Amino acid sequence: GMTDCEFGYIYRLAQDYLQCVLQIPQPGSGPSKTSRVLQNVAFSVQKEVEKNLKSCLDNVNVVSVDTARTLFNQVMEKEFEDGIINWGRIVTIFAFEGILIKKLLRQQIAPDVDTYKEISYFVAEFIMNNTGEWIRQNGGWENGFVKKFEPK
Amino acid sequence: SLLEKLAEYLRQMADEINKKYVK
Incomplete structure (x- = not known):
């Protein structure tokens, strides 16, 4: 629907994906159709980035949620600085938060089981503020993203 | 440099x- 560009829905998508990466999906009714489609395509992107940029990703130490947030904001800002928005770029936002939570799990100085909820929050903040209008104009998650990325 | 790569x-x-052009 059109309200799926609001923060709450995006936050749930970002949290769903981190729980997917961390292998702790919550035993509710299950992730939404949107999330189920997003998890497969974002993970495929994530594993390709971690491979080709392995040596690159070993030069930064995500020791805290603050380092993850500034690193996320910095990298994402430069990715979208040309003003272009598309579903592929939005997918890479989720892929990158998955890269960050994996590094946090290993390197976080004081690990906290709620940390991935803080990551999901500033991920959703970025998506809403920088792509929310574009998402709505292109059908939202249900009528835009899912229609283009769901199985043939 | 890192953040640019x-x-x-x-x-x-x-x-x-x-280019997932469908529907």
């Missing part, structure tokens, strides 16, 4: 997978 590769792979 990450931003570049993400932008590349983004516009790459973006």
Whole structure:
């Protein structure tokens, strides 16, 4: 629907994906159709980035949620600085938060089981503020993203 | 330098997978 560009829905998508990466999906009714489609395509992107940029990703130490947030904001800002928005770029936002939570799990100085909820929050903040209008104009998650990325 | 390499590769792979043209 059109309200799926609001923060709450995006936050749930970002949290769903981190729980997917961390292998702790919550035993509710299950992730939404949107999330189920997003998890497969974002993970495929994530594993390709971690491979080709392995040596690159070993030069930064995500020791805290603050380092993850500034690193996320910095990298994402430069990715979208040309003003272009598309579903592929939005997918890479989720892929990158998955890269960050994996590094946090290993390197976080004081690990906290709620940390991935803080990551999901500033991920959703970025998506809403920088792509929310574009998402709505292109059908939202249900009528835009899912229609283009769901199985043939 | 690091943050530019990450931003570049993400932008590349983004516009790459973006050609999921369906519906």
